Amino acid sequence: MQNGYTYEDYQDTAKWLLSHTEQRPQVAVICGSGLGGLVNKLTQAQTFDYSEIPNFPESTVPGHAGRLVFGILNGRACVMMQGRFHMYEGYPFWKVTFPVRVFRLLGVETLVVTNAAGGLNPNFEVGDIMLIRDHINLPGFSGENPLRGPNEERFGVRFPAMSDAYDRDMRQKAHSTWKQMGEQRELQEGTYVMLGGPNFETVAECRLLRNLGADAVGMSTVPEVIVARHCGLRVFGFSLITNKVIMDTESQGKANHEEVLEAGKQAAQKLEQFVSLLMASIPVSGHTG
Amino acid sequence: MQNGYTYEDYQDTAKWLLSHTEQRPQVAVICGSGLGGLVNKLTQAQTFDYSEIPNFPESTVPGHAGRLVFGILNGRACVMMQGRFHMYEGYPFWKVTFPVRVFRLLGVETLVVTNAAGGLNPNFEVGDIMLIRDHINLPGFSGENPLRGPNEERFGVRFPAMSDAYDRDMRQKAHSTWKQMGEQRELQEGTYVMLGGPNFETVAECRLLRNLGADAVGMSTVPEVIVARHCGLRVFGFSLITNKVIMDTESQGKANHEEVLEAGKQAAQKLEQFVSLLMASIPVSGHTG
Amino acid sequence: MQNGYTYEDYQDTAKWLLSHTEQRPQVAVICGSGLGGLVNKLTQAQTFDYSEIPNFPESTVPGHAGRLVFGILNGRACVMMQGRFHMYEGYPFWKVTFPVRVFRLLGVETLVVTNAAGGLNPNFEVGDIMLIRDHINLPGFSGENPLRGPNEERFGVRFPAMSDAYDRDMRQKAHSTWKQMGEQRELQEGTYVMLGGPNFETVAECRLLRNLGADAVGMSTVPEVIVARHCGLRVFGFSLITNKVIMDTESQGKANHEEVLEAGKQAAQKLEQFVSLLMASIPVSGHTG
């Protein structure tokens, strides 16, 4: 729709950040669920509450206190969003993706996105890390898209391609790095499907999503990838399989957000060490290279 | 979206009803198409036009005059909506489901939903009664959901599960009761898929819906089930197969709302006797149990 | 939704056109991409910029200057829209389809729609002309429909059927006419699927769309067909396969709008001659029959 944000608004917000921190991030990380503790490994960290940054969507999301943190992670200068915005909260896609365009204006070149998702692929287990190789944007099928409305030429083209959204070179490096970590479990990889939420899927819906080729289901990230790729950002992400969805009517139980503990505690730790290692493989700047 | 209705609005409406009728319903029934004559078997019935109840969405739906009726059906005190609201009419999901939350505030514990649907499953025949076992909420895939926006803790949780939406015990009782009625035709059961409407599906669309596992297609009910399950209501419903959809391009005809007569006359009668019998199987209160 | 246009607005716009041109079109053509040069074969042509016609949606679409042209094409009086409106531009469906209802009020009886689409069907080649036999309206699954809101009885019914949307007799005539042209390539025919856009599909999304039975993917036309069929217009259309979508992650490239040249130049020429020939096969009026 007619995005309430004009190009100038993004620039004003980016200019404000540049005048309050000496940090100049090259990488931006959007933390979903488990990775919320990643902020603790950042050195020379400076925090900003989403509430003090003009034009920034303020949020009351149940999970992580809305704050943007600048700092150095494994020799790389980066900025991370500790907590994201979701459509199910009431925000339209142009609000949820506002920070992505600001990152581009700060000079960021790579965006790393993480989330927690239900595993549809039968071969997945709770705690599995799935490298997002592709996605299915269901809201986009009905015209719900962050790029809807008049295109801002200063950010990208009118009809951007999405077939190469997930940087191949990074997925290659992620696999090598996982091997060096000596993990007993293999690093999964697959396509993520986004739904609006906030309720959890029914058995019928999960079987449908699986037939369509989806490996994991979630309620975010996709709009952020579209906007990131639209403005030229290199993109790669990970889903933390927090639960194995039930595909049988003879359900031994039902879904709930207990995932904060499940995976969010055990698999999240590894996920942090993982992203920290990857900072050294991202091309140019940041480190002494 | 930001639901125009605040918690207080639901309470004000519920308080108004309590001060105008001595009736205290334990069960709520939403009548779709055929079951519109169910109001005639209610004893000690009191009628309210949707127009006289504050905050209630007023409607001009082609089918049944908008009125809420309180009364006793087979020893059970209940309230029924003679006519529902539809998205295709212009109403957003928070408007269509407003009555469901009021029912909860009146102390209702069970919601029975009925509708008329096109039979996708090849084994169905016009006049078939299909017990809704599951559903596929297509509008929900794009973020069109009655729960969209900030959650009202007083009604339910942020991420409610939908896998157990259709009460198993009631589906068990419905089957036993159907047997006692001595019906020649079996009681069908399956998954209902909702579409926005108001136009009827194309051959291509029907084959798609069927492949996805849907047994019947309709333009309502799903949002009501989501909200009902969100606030703790026990739920069970029935679809009246008013027509067998054409899956061939060599179409012997096209769809139209003649269904008011077809099934709406013949199968509706049985559907009424059916729901009347079930009132005695619903757990606790109402009757002398 | 509550369409901002009242019946009177359509009539006022139709009355304005009737008072500015002596032309009385019997056929209306909506040009998509390649067919944009069709306006050049019209005799006794009169042009109107969308900007000078009251109530008409003004546009800034990248492709063809928004103008409505009246004239005679192969002995048939018709009106063509050189450039259409798209949802991805910000327009809701009631805005995009406004001209379709005006055409009906001018006395038009047949609507011909054309577009450019990605070929999903493996048997298609760039430059292929695909007769649209059916469609899958994805935005319609979520309630995004030009007929959403209170029905205007003066245009059509509340629940119009779509199974016979693409006039069979015309598809029969189109095939005969193609044979007379002596084309080396066969005239394709299939179902078109619409997506919101404006970004191009991912590999995962294309495989999904293909599994659902779609032969070609596009970002328009469907809403126009729904409204046309709702008001009684005979409808038939063509998709110009401007590109073969990549269904493999080992992508030799990515999508982009270079299609203006590809097909838009080579296959468009034939497409024009094609529509010009068909003008003589459309039933009654226009010509001396």
> Looking at chain B, which residue has its C-alpha nearest residue C1?
B90
How far is C144 from C221, CA to CA, in rounded Å? 14
DSSP chain B: ---S--HHHHHHHHHHHHTT-S---SEEEEE-GGGGGGGGG-EEEEEEETTTSTTPPP---SSS--EEEEEEETTEEEEEEES---GGGT--HHHHTHHHHHHHHTT--EEEEEEEEEE-STT--TT-EEEEEEEEEHHHHTT--TT-SS--TTT--SS---TT-S-HHHHHHHHHHHHHTT-SS--EEEEEEE---SSPPPHHHHHHHHHTT-SEEESSSHHHHHHHHHTT-EEEEEEEEEEE---SSS-S----GGGGTTTTTHHHHHHHHHHHHHTTTS-SSSS--
Q: Answer yes or no: do A90 and B163 touch at CB < 8 A.
A: no
Q: Is A219 annotated as a binding residue?
A: yes
CA-wise closest residue to A275 among A29, A25, A24? A29
Pairing status of strand A129-137 against strand A234-244: antiparallel
User: Which residues of chain C does A133 touch, with a Cβ-Cβ cutoff of 8 Å?
Assistant: 249
Q: Answer yes or no: do B87 and C148 touch at CB < 8 A.
A: yes
How far is B201 from B207, CA to CA, in rounded Å? 10
Exposed, middle or buried: residue A47 (CB in 10 Å: 0-12, 13-18, 19+)?
A: middle
In contact, C101 and C83? CB cutoff 8 Å: no
Q: Answer yes or no: do B133 and A202 touch at CB < 8 A.
A: no
A235 has which bridge partners? A111
Q: Which of B14, B77, B81, B116 is catalytic?
A: B116
List the single residue in C88, C199, C249 with the smallest CB-CB distance to A162. Answer: C199
In contact, B209 and C138? CB cutoff 8 Å: no
Burial A239-251 (b: 16+ CB within 10 A, else e): bbbbbebbeeeee
Query: Which parts of C41-164 fold into alpha helices (H)?
Result: 93-96, 98-105, 138-141
User: Which residues of chain C does B1 touch, with a Cβ-Cβ cutoff of 8 Å?
Assistant: none
How far is B40 from B45, CA to CA, in rounded Å? 9
**Would residue B88 show up in a list of annotated catalytic residues for this protein?**
yes
**Which residue bears the tokens 């799903």?**
B222
Please say whether the dihedral angle defined by the alpha carbons of residues C50, C51, C56 and C58, taken in this order, is positive or negative. positive
Give the resolution in Å: 2.0
Rg, chain C, Cα only? 18
CA distances (Å), origin A119, targets B102, B113, C35, C202: 36, 32, 46, 21
Encoded amino acid at B288, one letter: T
Q: Is A135 annotated as a binding residue?
A: no
Phi, psi dihedrals of residue B149, rounded to the nearest 5°: 120, -170
**Would residue A123 show up in a list of annotated catalytic residues for this protein?**
no
How far is C123 from C125, CA to CA, in rounded Å? 7
The gap from C-alpha A226 to its chain's centroid, in whole angstroms, comes to 11
Q: Is C84 annotated as a binding residue?
A: yes
CATH code, A283: 3.40.50.1580
In contact, C170 and C277? CB cutoff 8 Å: no
C129 has which bridge partners? C240
CA distances (Å), origin A109, targets A31, A76, A156, A174, A206: 17, 12, 14, 18, 35
C20 has which bridge partners? none
How far is B70 from A52, CA to CA, in rounded Å? 53
Residues 6+ apart with CB under 8 A from C280: C74, C75, C76, C287
For chain B, which chains pass the contact test of at least 3 CB pairs under 8 Å?
A, C
Q: What approach was used to elucidate this structure?
A: X-ray
CA-wise closest residue to B129 among B143, B112, B115, B144? B115
Our count of domains for chain C comes to: 1
First to last CA, chain C: 41
CA distances (Å), origin B119, targets B29, B86, B256, C183: 23, 20, 14, 43
Q: Is B80 annotated as a binding residue?
A: no
**Which residue bears the tokens 């980016």?**
A14
The tokens of A247 are what? Answer: 């595909």
CA distances (Å), origin A128, targets A117, A237, A243, A269, C252: 10, 14, 9, 12, 31
Residues 6+ apart with CB under 8 A from C5: C55, C94, C98, C101
User: Which residues of chain C does B196 touch, with a Cβ-Cβ cutoff of 8 Å?
Assistant: 140-145, 148
How far is B222 from B225, CA to CA, in rounded Å? 5
Q: Is B175 annotated as a binding residue?
A: no
Rg, chain B, Cα only? 18
How far is B99 from B5, CA to CA, in rounded Å? 11
How far is C33 from C262, CA to CA, in rounded Å? 11
Q: Is A88 annotated as a binding residue?
A: yes
List the single residue in B2, B160, B213 with the smallest CB-CB distance to A199. Answer: B160
The length of chain C, given as a count of residues: 289
Q: Is C111 helix (H, G, I), strand (E, B) or coil?
A: strand
**Which residue bears the tokens 């105008």?**
B20
> Looking at chain C, which residue has its C-alpha nearest residue A190?
C204
How far is A76 from C182, CA to CA, in rounded Å? 65
The angle subtended at Cα A147 by Cα A24 and Cα B86, nearest 5°, is: 135
In contact, B114 and B275? CB cutoff 8 Å: yes
Q: HEC profile for chain A?
A: CCCCCCHHHHHHHHHHHHCCCCCCCCEEEEECHHHHHHHHHCEEEEEEECCCCCCCCCCCCCCCCCEEEEEEECCEEEEEEECCCCHHHCCCHHHHCHHHHHHHHCCCCEEEEEEEEEECCCCCCCCCEEEEEEEEEHHHHCCCCCCCCCCCCCCCCCCCCCCCCCCHHHHHHHHHHHHHCCCCCCCEEEEEEECCCCCCCCHHHHHHHHHCCCCEEECCCHHHHHHHHHCCCEEEEEEEEEEECCCCCCCCCCCCHHHHCCCCCHHHHHHHHHHHHHCCCCCCCCCCC
Mutation site for A-interface testing, chosen from C142, C205, C243, C247 by largest number of A Cβ within 10 Å: C205
Residues 6+ apart with CB under 8 A from B7: B152, B154, B155
How far is C262 from C280, CA to CA, in rounded Å? 29
Under 8 Å CB pairs connecting chains B and C tally to 103
CA distance C149 to chain B (A): 4
CA distances (Å), origin A38, targets A68, A111, A237, B192: 12, 15, 15, 43
Q: A interface toward B at CB cutoff 8 Å?
A: 60, 62, 87-90, 138-139, 141-144, 195-205, 207-208, 211, 246, 249, 251, 254-257
CA-wise closest residue to A95 among A71, A59, A142, A130? A59
CA-wise closest residue to B138 among A229, C145, A51? C145
Helix (H) or strand (E) holding C10: helix C7-18
Residues 6+ apart with CB under 8 A from A241: A117, A118, A119, A124, A125, A126, A127, A128, A129, A130, A188, A216, A263, A267
Q: C interface toward A at CB cutoff 8 Å?
A: 60, 62, 87-90, 138-139, 141-144, 195-205, 207-208, 211, 246, 249, 251, 254-257
For chain A, which chains pass the contact test of at least 3 CB pairs under 8 Å?
B, C
Tell me the residue range of the domain where A223 lies: 1-289
In contact, B131 and B238? CB cutoff 8 Å: yes
Residues 6+ apart with CB under 8 A from B30: B80, B81, B84, B99, B111, B112, B113, B114, B221, B224
In contact, C120 and C216? CB cutoff 8 Å: yes
How far is B174 from B119, CA to CA, in rounded Å? 20
The tokens of C122 are what? Answer: 């493996």
Half-sphere exposure of residue A100: CA atoms within 13 angstroms, side-chain side = 30
Q: Answer yes or no: do B205 and C137 touch at CB < 8 A.
A: yes
The tokens of A159 are what? Answer: 């009809």
**Would residue A59 show up in a list of annotated catalytic residues for this protein?**
no
In contact, A79 and A103? CB cutoff 8 Å: yes
List the single residue in C197, C198, C203 with the smallest CB-CB distance to A134. Answer: C203
In contact, B68 and B53? CB cutoff 8 Å: yes
Encoded amino acid at C44, one letter: Q
DSSP class of residue C7? H
In contact, A143 and C144? CB cutoff 8 Å: yes
The angle subtended at Cα A29 by Cα A25 and Cα A35, nearest 5°, is: 135
How far is A75 from C110, CA to CA, in rounded Å? 67
Q: Is C165 annotated as a binding residue?
A: no
> Looking at chain A, which residue has its C-alpha nearest residue C211?
A212
Helix (H) or strand (E) holding C242: strand C234-244
**Would residue A257 show up in a list of annotated catalytic residues for this protein?**
yes
Residues 6+ apart with CB under 8 A from C55: C5, C9, C10, C12, C13, C98
Q: Is C86 helix (H, G, I), strand (E, B) or coil?
A: coil
Q: Is A220 annotated as a binding residue?
A: yes
Residues 6+ apart with CB under 8 A from B40: none
Q: Is C46 helix (H, G, I), strand (E, B) or coil?
A: strand
How far is A178 from A128, CA to CA, in rounded Å? 12
CA distances (Å), origin A132, targets A236, A241, B203, C159: 7, 12, 35, 42
CA distance C19 to chain A (A): 34
Q: Is C145 helix (H, G, I), strand (E, B) or coil?
A: coil
Prior bond of B92 cis (ω within 30°): no
Phi, psi dihedrals of residue A14, rounded to the nearest 5°: -65, -40
A217 has which bridge partners? A118, A193
The angle subtended at Cα C123 by Cα C119 and Cα C128, nearest 5°, is: 55
Helix (H) or strand (E) holding C209: helix C203-211
Q: Is C268 helix (H, G, I), strand (E, B) or coil?
A: helix
> Which residues of C belong to the active site?
33, 64, 86, 88-89, 116, 219-220, 243, 257
**Would residue A33 show up in a list of annotated catalytic residues for this protein?**
yes
Q: Answer yes or no: do C255 and A137 touch at CB < 8 A.
A: no
List the single residue in A90, A139, A200 with the smallest CB-CB distance to B161. Answer: A200
**Which residue bears the tokens 């009431």?**
A90
The tokens of C256 are what? Answer: 């982009």
The tokens of B111 are what? Answer: 């919601």
Q: Is C37 helix (H, G, I), strand (E, B) or coil?
A: helix
User: Which residues of chain C does B60 touch, with a Cβ-Cβ cutoff of 8 Å?
Assistant: 150
How far is B238 from A220, CA to CA, in rounded Å? 34
In contact, C163 and B203? CB cutoff 8 Å: yes
How far is B271 from B38, CA to CA, in rounded Å? 9
**Would residue A51 show up in a list of annotated catalytic residues for this protein?**
no
**Would residue A219 show up in a list of annotated catalytic residues for this protein?**
yes
> Looking at chain C, which residue has its C-alpha nearest residue A191?
C204
How far is A85 from C250, CA to CA, in rounded Å? 33
The tokens of C29 are what? Answer: 């053509």
The tokens of B218 are what? Answer: 């309709």
User: Which residues of chain C does B88 touch, with a Cβ-Cβ cutoff of 8 Å?
Assistant: 143, 145, 147-149
Q: Is C95 helix (H, G, I), strand (E, B) or coil?
A: helix
Q: Is C229 helix (H, G, I), strand (E, B) or coil?
A: helix
User: Which residues of chain B does A211 touch, with a Cβ-Cβ cutoff of 8 Å?
Assistant: 212
B84: left (phi over 0), alpha (psi -120 to 50) or beta: beta
Q: What is the dihedral of CA C95, C97, C99, C102, to 10 degrees?
A: -100
How far is B49 from B81, CA to CA, in rounded Å? 10
Burial A78-91 (b: 16+ CB within 10 A, else e): bbbbbbbbbbbbeb
